Nucleic acid binder design. Sequence first.
RNA 1: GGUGCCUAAUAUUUAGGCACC
Length: 152
Amino acid sequence: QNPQQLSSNLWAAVRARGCQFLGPAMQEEALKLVLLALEDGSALSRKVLVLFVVQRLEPRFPQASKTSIGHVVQLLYRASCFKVTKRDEDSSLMQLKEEFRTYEALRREHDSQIVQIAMEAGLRIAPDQWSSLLYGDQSHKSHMQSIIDKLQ
RNA sequence: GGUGCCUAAUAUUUAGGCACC
Ligand SMILES: [Cl-]
Ligand SMILES: [Cl-]
């Protein structure tokens, strides 16, 4: 198992559960726009959360789509970041749980969920490679080692 | 077979399409 392999095996695993990582720049700006919509306790359907993040993301990142942002929203939902108000005959509304209404706390949950998908897929990826994959630098290895230890 | 993307749904997930290998 070389790195170019583990990275393509990691991203395919992620997309297999209907989730997505748009690269370290765009994913960071995607999460922030999710926080911009939700940090005040506003309650948005998937559809309105997607339109909000897509429309603001588009001018800097033209590849942003309802599908690609749906997949990022699915990653947060799969990480159990949302309070979901279920009503009859209507779309469920999503709020950010009180504990995940800041970027640091939301991002930790996001990183953790990608690591659980690596483990579900039997992928064994060291922290230097994690730092690279999620942040595009080597400045997050400890962060990553912290999430790996919690999950084991 | 496999990947990638697009469209749709109240999705801890589905369903459909195209492209490429
Ligand atoms: Cl409400
Ligand atoms: Cl809450």
